[PDB]
Amino acid sequence: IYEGQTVQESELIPQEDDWVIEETNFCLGRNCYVRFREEDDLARRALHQMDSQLNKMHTRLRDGTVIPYMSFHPDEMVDRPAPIHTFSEKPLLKWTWDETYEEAYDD
Amino acid sequence: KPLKIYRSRLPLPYRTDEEISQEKYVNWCGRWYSYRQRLQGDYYSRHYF
Amino acid sequence: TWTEIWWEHDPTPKVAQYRPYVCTVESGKVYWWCACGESKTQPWVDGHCKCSKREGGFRPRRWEPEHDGVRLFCGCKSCFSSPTWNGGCFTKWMQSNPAGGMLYCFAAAFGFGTLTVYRKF
Amino acid sequence: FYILVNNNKRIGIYYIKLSIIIGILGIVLSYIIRVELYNSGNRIIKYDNVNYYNMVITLHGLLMIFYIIMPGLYGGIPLYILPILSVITDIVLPRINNISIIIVLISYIVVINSIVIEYNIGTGWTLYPPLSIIGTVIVNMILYGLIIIGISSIISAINFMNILIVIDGIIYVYIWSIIITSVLLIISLPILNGILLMILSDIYFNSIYFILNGDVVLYQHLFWYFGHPEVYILILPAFGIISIILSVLNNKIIFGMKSMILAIIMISILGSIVWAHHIYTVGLELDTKIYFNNLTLIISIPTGNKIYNWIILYIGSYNILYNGYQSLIFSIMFIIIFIIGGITGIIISIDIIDIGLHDTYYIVSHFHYILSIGAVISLLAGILLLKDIIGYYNVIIKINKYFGLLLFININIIFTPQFIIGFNVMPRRILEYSDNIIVWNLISSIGSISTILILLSIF
Amino acid sequence: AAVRSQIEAAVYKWTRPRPPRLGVAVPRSPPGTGILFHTNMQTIRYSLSP
Amino acid sequence: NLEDHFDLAEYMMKMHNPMSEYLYWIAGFVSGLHGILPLLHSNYYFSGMFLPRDNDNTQLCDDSW
Amino acid sequence: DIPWPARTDWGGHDPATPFAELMINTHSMFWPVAIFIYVSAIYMVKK
Numbered sequence: 001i002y003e004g005q006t007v008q009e010s011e012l013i014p015q016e017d018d019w020v021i022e023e024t025n026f027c028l029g030r031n032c033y034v035r036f037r038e039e040d041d042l043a044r045r046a047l048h049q050m051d052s053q054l055n056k057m058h059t060r061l062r063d064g065t066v067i068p069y070m071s072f073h074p075d076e077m078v079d080r081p082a083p084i085h086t087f088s089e090k091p092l093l094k095w096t097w098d099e100t101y102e103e104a105y106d107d
Numbered sequence: 108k109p110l111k112i113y114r115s116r117l118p119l120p121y122r123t124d125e126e127i128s129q130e131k132y133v134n135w136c137g138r139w140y141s142y143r144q145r146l147q148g149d150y151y152s153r154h155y156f
Numbered sequence: 157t158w159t160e161i162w163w164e165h166d167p168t169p170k171v172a173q174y175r176p177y178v179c180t181v182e183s184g185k186v187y188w189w190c191a192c193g194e195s196k197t198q199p200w201v202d203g204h205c206k207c208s209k210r211e212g213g214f215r216p217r218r219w220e221p222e223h224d225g226v227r228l229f230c231g232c233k234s235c236f237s238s239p240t241w242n243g244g245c246f247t248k249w250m251q252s253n254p255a256g257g258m259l260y261c262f263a264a265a266f267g268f269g270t271l272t273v274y275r276k277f
Numbered sequence: 278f279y280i281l282v283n284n285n286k287r288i289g290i291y292y293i294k295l296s297i298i299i300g301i302l303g304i305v306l307s308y309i310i311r312v313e314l315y316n317s318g319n320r321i322i323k324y325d326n327v328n329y330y331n332m333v334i335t336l337h338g339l340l341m342i343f344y345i346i347m348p349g350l351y352g353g354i355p356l357y358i359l360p361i362l363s364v365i366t367d368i369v370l371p372r373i374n375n376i377s378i379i380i381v382l383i384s385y386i387v388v389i390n391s392i393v394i395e396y397n398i399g400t401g402w403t404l405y406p407p408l409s410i411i412g413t414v415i416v417n418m419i420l421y422g423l424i425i426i427g428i429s430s431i432i433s434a435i436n437f438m439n440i441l442i443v444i445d446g447i448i449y450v451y452i453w454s455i456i457i458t459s460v461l462l463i464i465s466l467p468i469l470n471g472i473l474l475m476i477l478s479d480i481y482f483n484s485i486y487f488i489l490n491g492d493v494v495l496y497q498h499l500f501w502y503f504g505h506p507e508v509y510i511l512i513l514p515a516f517g518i519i520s521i522i523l524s525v526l527n528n529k530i531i532f533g534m535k536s537m538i539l540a541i542i543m544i545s546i547l548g549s550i551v552w553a554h555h556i557y558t559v560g561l562e563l564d565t566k567i568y569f570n571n572l573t574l575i576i577s578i579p580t581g582n583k584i585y586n587w588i589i590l591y592i593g594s595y596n597i598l599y600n601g602y603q604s605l606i607f608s609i610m611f612i613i614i615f616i617i618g619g620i621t622g623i624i625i626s627i628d629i630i631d632i633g634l635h636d637t638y639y640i641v642s643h644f645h646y647i648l649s650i651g652a653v654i655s656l657l658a659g660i661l662l663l664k665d666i667i668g669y670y671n672v673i674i675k676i677n678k679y680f681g682l683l684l685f686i687n688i689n690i691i692f693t694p695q696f697i698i699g700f701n702v703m704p705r706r707i708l709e710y711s712d713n714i715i716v717w718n719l720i721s722s723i724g725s726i727s728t729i730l731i732l733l734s735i736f
Numbered sequence: 737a738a739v740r741s742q743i744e745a746a747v748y749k750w751t752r753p754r755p756p757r758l759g760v761a762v763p764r765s766p767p768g769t770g771i772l773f774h775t776n777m778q779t780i781r782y783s784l785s786p
Numbered sequence: 787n788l789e790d791h792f793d794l795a796e797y798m799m800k801m802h803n804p805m806s807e808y809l810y811w812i813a814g815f816v817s818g819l820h821g822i823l824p825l826l827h828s829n830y831y832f833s834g835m836f837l838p839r840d841n842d843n844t845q846l847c848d849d850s851w
Numbered sequence: 852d853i854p855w856p857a858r859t860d861w862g863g864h865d866p867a868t869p870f871a872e873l874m875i876n877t878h879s880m881f882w883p884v885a886i887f888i889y890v891s892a893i894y895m896v897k898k
């Protein structure tokens with residue numbers, strides 16, 4: 001069963017005595033129904049919808065990396081509402097292993 | 108022979124020098140989050156079962 | 157007992173009261189709940205407790221009611237549904253006075269047994 | 278275009294749209310039934326038009342099973358998300374997907390047209406001979422609808438099976454749920470077609486299978502060899518939905534994924550070999566009865582494992598997250614409701630208990646709690662979860678605690694009393710009844726009118 | 737009341753929990769490490785000792 | 787094109803003509819009528835009345851109405 | 852013998868044969884197990 005990543009005590013040792021757990025808000029913000037402008041036409045309302053996607057949002061950490069909107073299933077990865085053609089570039093499921101080959105390295 | 112890819116030629120996502128100096132801190136937070144997660148699993152499993 | 161015997165890196169509150177605080181709340185207003193049990197304006201942060209000063213990992217707990225009414229609020233500072241009360245105040249009390257806990261539980265079970273048996277029989 | 282579209286997501290919307298439309302006719306028939314049963318006497322159907330009631334109950338059952346819940350849970354949600362869950366661009370067979378929905382609509386038009394034009398008589402949704410073969414042409418029309426529906430079901434099953442060849446990710450539990458239902462269809466439908474053809478032969482080709490020296494019990498074997506696999510073809514997609522909703526909304530990884538998957542496979546194999554629990558009162562041999570009773574009770578084991586794995590998904594979830602969303606409430610309500618339906622199923626599984634409870638309203642309440650409550654709520658919960666992805670609006674459902682509470686209370690007012698009258702006893706498929714059963718029938722009728730009123734508040 | 741406090745104090749002393757026998761492979765916290773998290777973390781249910 | 791990105795773009799962007807919704811509701815309403823109209827027609831055909839009067843197939847008191 | 856108004860008759864009523872008594876008792880025997888299965892599962896439907 002999965003119980004999280006394994007931690008060695010050495011990795012829990014801080015580099016400063018004042019280090020605490022970063023208090024970054026992971027609430028993306030306040031939202032509601034997407035509100036279109038009357039002036040916008042069909043094309044410009046499409047752009048508006050594409051700019052309100054929660055799955056394109058993320059939270060930036062103190063070191064500049066961002067934790068993205070994540071989901072257990074790929075159903076939450078398409079634009080909402082679903083466009084006619086979704087996964088043009090095949091979504092990549094990344095598997096990890098310990099195998100390596102020499103060609104990838106240089107001395 | 109196989110084609111060669113050079114990681115040194117890849118443009119990187121923008122990160123300030125201040126942010127780059129905090130990498131160890133963020134890793135440290137991640138380990139403590141995994142430690143707290145794993146312990147809580149045992150605690151909760153005992154309580155609810 | 158998570159803070160007491162399992163994990164020593166989370167802030168541990170002081171019990172203000174082993175009973176919930178009854179308060180009238182209004183929709184559209186934001187309330188701040190004391191998570192350390194040392195505020196003198198319970199159940200709210202008074203501006204002088206640990207939560208107000210952001211000391212020792214204590215922070216005020218934001219809360220907002222959907223509708224107006226009277227709501228129960230946690231005094232033990234450990235209820236699962238904090239700031240709201242769900243009975244954790246009694247549970248935490250039993251941990252601190254296990255002999256008393258047995259007395260109440262026996263009495264509650266005794267009443268439940270009598271009524272259910274009397275009606276069904 | 279509208280009818281020419283091959284987009285798998287558009288076709289999924291069509292399936293839900295058509296299920297609601299046809300569903301209006303289904304609910305109306307249900308209201309007729311409950312109105313009639315409000316007291317003893319004739320209320321809305323004349324004593325000289327009792328054949329209409331027999332037709333109402335027959336069409337109610339057939340439409341709700343084959344034209345509403347099956348197109349909604351096996352055609353609607355599946356055609357919209359399955360290709361996305363499989364990280365594939367579109368469904369494997371685009372043109373077949375288009376014709377399947379068109380076929381469903383055409384078979385629906387045939388059925389309703391037969392109401393208007395043919396004499397109205399009924400033989401139950403189980404079309405038992407010899408009654409089914411001595412009827413009028415409306416029975417012939419209904420047979421054509423079922424056969425046509427069977428074509429759509431099988432080709433759709435072929436479509437989903439081909440996802441195994443193209444799936445680019447991991448087969449999630451929901452995908453496993455649809456694949457196994459597809460397998461159940463591929464193995465059960467061909468048997469149904471054969472027995473339906475024999476019904477036609479006796480109706481239209483002067484065949485003699487269902488007259489003396491021919492065993493009428495033969496039909497019941499072949500029919501129910503498809504019948505019971507059908508009830509699991511209708512519930513398994515619902516189980517798949519429940520798994521996704523609980524994991525997503527509680528932010529908890531599915532526990533015992535492989536046991537969930539192996540529980541679905543097990544239910545299918547067992548569901549393919551227990552059909553004769555519908556034939557307990559015919560007079561089968563003692564050993565046959567004992568075999569079927571034994572295997573029927575076994576189905577509870579895999580079904581029970583899934584229920585408990587769902588419970589732990591909801592346990593321990595963060596309190597800060599708002600739990601009043603309609604999708605979450607419906608998913609939780611499914612566990613509470615399905616256990617009631619399943620337990621009563623185990624009660625009726627004991628054949629000696631079944632002698633008293635066969636062809637009584639206890640059976641009705643049993644399969645209503647699972648389908649009319651459980652399956653409906655599961656389809657609603659699934660659509661509600663995909664509201665943003667689907668994009669529909671102009672309804673007040675997403676956060677409506679009044680609707681959920683009123684629905685739960687009133688739906689139970691309808692069918693809980695039907696368990697009581699099962700030991701009274703009130704037979705099924707009847708309209709008139711003794712005066713001492715009015716109280717419970719009246720209470721259920723009050724429940725039916727109330728549920729309909731609550732359906733208007735969503736708009 | 738004297739007996740009440742006596743039995744209350746007798747029960748209390750016996751029930752005080754001992755450290756759990758972790759059934760999971762976790763590291764030892766570095767020595768001298770205090771409170772690092774805050775009270776806005778998702779609440780962890782308060783569970784009675786066995 | 788941007789207009790073609792979303793399936794049913796007019797409806798999703800909230801510009802669709804309301805007549806489409808009206809037709810959908812009308813279609814459902816017609817479907818419902820297939821259970822009521824034949825009921826009335828069949829009742830009249832075999833009795834001469836479109837709908838019965840509660841308990842008119844049983845013995846009624848003199849003052850019953 | 853005949854249905855009576857507003858009667859639960861849970862498991863059956865008024866048996867007049869040994870087999871009829873058997874049917875009533877079979878239902879009564881399993882009923883507590885059904886209650887256990889329900890109560891035990893429902894009690895854990897919560898956060």
Ligand SMILES: CCCCCCCCCCCCCCCCCC(=O)OC[C@H](COP(=O)([O-])OCC(O)COP(=O)([O-])OC[C@@H](COC(=O)CCCCCCCCCCCCCCCCC)OC(=O)CCCCCCCCCCCCCCCCC)OC(=O)CCCCCCCCCCCCCCCCC
Nearest residue numbers: 297300669794797802806807809810811812813814815816
């Ligand atoms: C169970 C119920 C409760 C459920 C509650 C829970 C619900 C939860 C949420 C569920 C959500 C599911 C997913 C939704 C996705 C929606 C996607 C969407 O909107 O797609 C876009 C799609 C189309 O939008 P578009 O892209 O702009 O399409 C443009 C067109 O393609 C092109 O535009 P166009 O203008 O060129 O269009 C062509 C148009 C041209 O139209 C016109 O020119 C119309 C002219 C006016 C005619 C008006 C009707 C006249 C009737 C007269 C009757 C006279 C009777 C006289 C009796 C006399 C007696 C003495 O139409 C046609 O030419 C063909 C029309 C064919 C369809 C209509 C058929 C009507 C019935 C016919 C029955 C015939 C029976 C014959 C029997 C014969 C026996 C011998 O939307 C729709 O089609 C409307 C959907 C509206 C509802 C959406 C769902 C909302 C949420 C649920 C609300 C509750 C609904 C409850 C069910 C209904 C209850 C009644």
Ligand code: HEA
Nearest residue numbers: 508512554577580581619620622623625626634635644647
């Ligand atoms: C989707 C719908 C659906 C589902 C899931 C089921 C599920 C079951 N049904 Fe079915 N049934 C119908 C729909 C359904 N049924 C219909 C529509 C009819 C009537 C058709 C007609 O006659 O016209 C019918 C008729 C029917 C009868 C006929 C009674 C009669 O004709 O007199 C019987 C009896 O064997 C039966 C049994 C069962 C059993 C034993 C299950 C099992 O699947 C139930 C399993 C679930 C549980 C058991 C609860 C969950 C598990 C646990 C909580 C574990 C713990 C429980 C135990 C250890 C027991 N059903």
Ligand code: HEA
Nearest residue numbers: 300307310334338341342401402648649656657705706707
């Ligand atoms: C899944 C199929 C299904 C559904 C939903 C229902 C729903 C209902 N049924 Fe059901 N019924 C059957 C299948 C179904 N029934 C079958 C198969 C029989 C036996 C047939 C026979 O005897 O031959 C039967 C028999 C039957 C009878 C027995 C008549 C008799 O034979 O004597 C009665 C009345 O007592 C009745 C009443 C109801 C009521 C009041 C509702 C509901 O109205 C209760 C209220 C619930 C709702 C109004 C919501 C329903 C909404 C939808 C279905 C649309 C969902 C669509 C989406 C979510 C997109 N039904």
Ligand SMILES: [O-][O-]
Nearest residue numbers: 504505508622
């Ligand atoms: O049918 O179970």
Ligand SMILES: [Cu+2]
Nearest residue numbers: 504505552555
């Ligand atoms: Cu069955």
Ligand SMILES: [K+]
Nearest residue numbers: 313316317318
């Ligand atoms: K009647």
Ligand SMILES: [Zn+2]
Nearest residue numbers: 190192205207
């Ligand atoms: Zn404080």
Ligand SMILES: [Zn+2]
Nearest residue numbers: 230232235245
């Ligand atoms: Zn508290």
